[PDB]
Amino acid sequence: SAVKAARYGKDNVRVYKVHKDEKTGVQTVYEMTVCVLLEGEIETSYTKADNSVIVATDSIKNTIYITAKQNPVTPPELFGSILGTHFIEKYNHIHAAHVNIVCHRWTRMDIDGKPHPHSFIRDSEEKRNVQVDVVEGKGIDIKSSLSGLTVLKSTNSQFWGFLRDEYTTLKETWDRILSTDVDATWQWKNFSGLQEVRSHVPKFDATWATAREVTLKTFAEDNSASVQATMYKMAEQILARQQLIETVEYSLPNKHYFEIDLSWHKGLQNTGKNAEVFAPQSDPNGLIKCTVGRS
Amino acid sequence: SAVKAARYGKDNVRVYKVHKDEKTGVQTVYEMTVCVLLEGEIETSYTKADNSVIVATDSIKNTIYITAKQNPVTPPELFGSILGTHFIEKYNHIHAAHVNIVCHRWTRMDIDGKPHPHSFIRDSEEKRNVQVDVVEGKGIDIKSSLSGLTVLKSTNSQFWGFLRDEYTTLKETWDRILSTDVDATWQWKNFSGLQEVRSHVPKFDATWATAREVTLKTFAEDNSASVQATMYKMAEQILARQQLIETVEYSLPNKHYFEIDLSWHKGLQNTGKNAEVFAPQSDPNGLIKCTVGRS
Amino acid sequence: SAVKAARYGKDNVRVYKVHKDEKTGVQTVYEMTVCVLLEGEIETSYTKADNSVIVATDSIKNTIYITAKQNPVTPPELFGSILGTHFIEKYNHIHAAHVNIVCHRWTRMDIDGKPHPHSFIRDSEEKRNVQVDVVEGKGIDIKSSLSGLTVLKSTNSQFWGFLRDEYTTLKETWDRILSTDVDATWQWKNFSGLQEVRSHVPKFDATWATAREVTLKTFAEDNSASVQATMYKMAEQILARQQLIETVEYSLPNKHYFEIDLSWHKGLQNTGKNAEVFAPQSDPNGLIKCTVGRS
Amino acid sequence: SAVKAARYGKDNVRVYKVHKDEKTGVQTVYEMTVCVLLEGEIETSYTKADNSVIVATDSIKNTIYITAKQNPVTPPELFGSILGTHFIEKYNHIHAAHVNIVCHRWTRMDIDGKPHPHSFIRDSEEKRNVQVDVVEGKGIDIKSSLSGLTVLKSTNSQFWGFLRDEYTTLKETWDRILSTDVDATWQWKNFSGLQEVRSHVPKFDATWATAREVTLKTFAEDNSASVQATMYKMAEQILARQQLIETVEYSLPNKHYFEIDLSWHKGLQNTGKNAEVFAPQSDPNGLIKCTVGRS
């Protein structure tokens, strides 16, 4: 037998960093969870028990803390690029590094209408993520994403005109609830290395903001024909507004809310136009995915 | 053997309700998870296999939906009181009802600086809860709470002067990070029944708001001597501002963030006044509880 | 305002211990999660910021490891008694200790029909737990439990003859699936202190085994009239077989499996006697509780 | 913009099936969670709001239940093949179906040394999974796996001789604890269609059993030089024992158990050869992956 592929590293590395503006006394905090996996000429650790080629995963953990101490940790696209470049430049036999970063929200508190200098709240479980693949001789590939963004609209969603056959029991509707957890990923054009990533630093936060704003406004304003059609509208605008993006991917569950017929009880009317009380369903759920690119 | 205590019912009942203002076109949504347990003269279902005394748990589920269709579901203290009173008034052999309600956040979206008429976001995993115990001949006991409120301050927290003996390794500090998940419960004076609960309806949302505001402002502004001392300050103000509350209970984990000594690596300075990168600890955690009442 | 109650300590302390039989080379492992909360004359830490009365929670953590190094950690009723007695004997102003222990399964592997000397498998998520309250001048109160034991029987469960009124839609049945997660707690007679707990050490594992065996055999062999009736049978036998137990408490969800009517599709028969494919329901669920004692 | 890829369907479909041997009265149960995603000529649902090409996800759910009613559901490789073939044969514009199945354990209870006819226990959270991709004109690709298998050995694991540089603090060791959660996947040679899958039905359960046995025996008996080296030994044997497998993939966390130095307390000895009490670490964790194929 032979080794066809192999990677190894450290997962679930939690990191916090604080920035303190000595002048204003204002502090800013960052918290993330980091995963780093390495690839290279490491097959003999598997086949011959030769540990000499292994950078210990404990050392990878150390490296993450040291890099965060000596560099900016925002935007995460920059920090991930710096960290993966380190490993392939530092170790001759390591030729690829895969860095995943999850950013956790710590939003500044407003007290008495004024923003507080050093207190924060986790105002949501929504994440900002990056996946950075650094490959020797092939540059830096970055996928940026937002995940965990949970929304609901109580009207202005429709679903009619779908295929009907002998497996079909679902009724057409012109007014329904639509709720989803948004997972959206934008993939950047390949970058030749760290200098190029640094030259675009301003676009990373602005594009994350645009992606969020467009997702929110399109969900609220689209009189939706389907999940499929609404998500395509989001992806299109984002591509239109940032030319360095090559593809946009959306993955959207359809979290169903079912009507409850109460007519068995004293003729109570709770369906169609009289629907007021609904049963959220934990499972199963629709799952709809799309990758949109340039034509 | 004998039955010394017994209760039974339905848990994890998910409910959504929408309100539609025909005039303005503005819609408002409510989502909760409900648990209802009953007590009464039901021992023979356990000892004699006599199911005649059992209100089926499926029927309890139905009752929750019907009650939500016919009554307001906010504030949750009112809805829980109405639902538990129904069971003890409707069934002669049922003498107590225990109703737990978890309210989930659906916050109105602002689009282009304007509040949207029918789109919402789960802006946090924080919950608003109630526990309502309705007991025949003994009125209605309500405990209201907020839970899941996650906060952090990066400075203005201290912990020195604690007991030191041969089990002690912790060092005193005058500047540390404090992070917690707030669980706060305020217990109302007993109410004689539904009419009295209805007469106080306005105080329920205002007190929840006060409890939140006081928790947030005290956490941000207190130069904290300990978790114990800061939480006592919160409980005291709340009691001072709502006379119908009898006790306030706080339960606060201390989620530790540890310094990381990097001096082994090129003399890097990352402790004490140079501390910038920290390691969040998943476990173990301090747990500190207090119940405060009137003197 | 005044402090009416207060406790504080360390939660989520993970502990592993290994025992090595030098003679046979056989090793045995134990893993648990420990919570210790203290009560006493500690109110001024809350009201006056006096940390002098506080045993730091970090010190409590240390104490747990040291105690495990110097004493047996099985049965958990003994280890919890030893640990809580330490705190009230060691600190004059601490008058109660609350110790919760969760035991995780590490079951010896059988390889080639022979039990392996040092390899283990987590053969289930079922836990063995203890709650030990040690109170100065009032002895040691122990509640032992098993939790997470998940079972299902595909026939020989019934539910008919329950109350029917205008809230009722559930149909009577003489053959249904019954599935639950067992939570069972047996409460021991108060013990005067450590010497008495030690004199009964053999009964702790034997009673846990009995409780398990009786739970399993009664569930499998009872032609169940209801959850209520079957759980009473379990509690009764346990009380009959261990006289040092004062009460037995069971808490049992009814995890529903619903029939699926497929007759809309080519007259397919899948209900009643032809029921073969069912839909497990994640929520809601029945919840049935009973505490049984001696008459 | 253009659609570059798209798939949609139903996730988290829970299914139970019972088999009843009329002759012996013995019953056997199966429970699984199913995900089915479809691909095809469906782009206009995204770009033109044309729902005519959509098979509703509710209909997919129905199809899963009907297929389970009319066919065997074991082994899961067969059931997944049957279900994905249905969709591409039934709908002309659907050209690929992706079926994921998770099998949950329901193990027959032994009562009084005898196997019970209709009672079961979830004896572990370990899963048996399949991923089946059915593609029009390209046959059936099956990946089978076991996941959630949690093990620990308390000795006969080593880790020395790894790379040491200025990022390294980890010490070499010749005796450590090794614990992991096993994720193992074996990929079958492509099959031309259902008849070929049916001709190999006996190999599916036997290979799952072999994969399990080899994983367990190698973990227990290997005096491990590293996670990398031990997992390669497992993959090699499996390939040696089933020629229809093309690749074997392992993904193994290294769940660390750290020594605790207690010497600060009365010279207590708890490290190296005196190590008895350890601290399980929840995070971070090593992550080691390997794909092994034929040479």
Ligand SMILES: O=c1[nH]c(=O)c2nn[nH]c2[nH]1
């Ligand atoms: O938006 C929707 N898309 C779908 O594909 C679907 N199928 N069922 N309901 C649905 N709603």
Ligand SMILES: O=c1[nH]c(=O)c2nn[nH]c2[nH]1
């Ligand atoms: O606020 C705190 N309270 C405590 O009781 C404690 N113990 N350790 N650290 C602590 N911090």
Ligand SMILES: O=c1[nH]c(=O)c2nn[nH]c2[nH]1
């Ligand atoms: O065993 C049962 N007990 C109950 O109380 C019940 N209510 N609905 N179904 C039930 N089954």
Ligand SMILES: O=c1[nH]c(=O)c2nn[nH]c2[nH]1
């Ligand atoms: O088995 C191991 N493999 C590794 O790659 C490693 N790195 N640190 N510890 C380790 N143990």
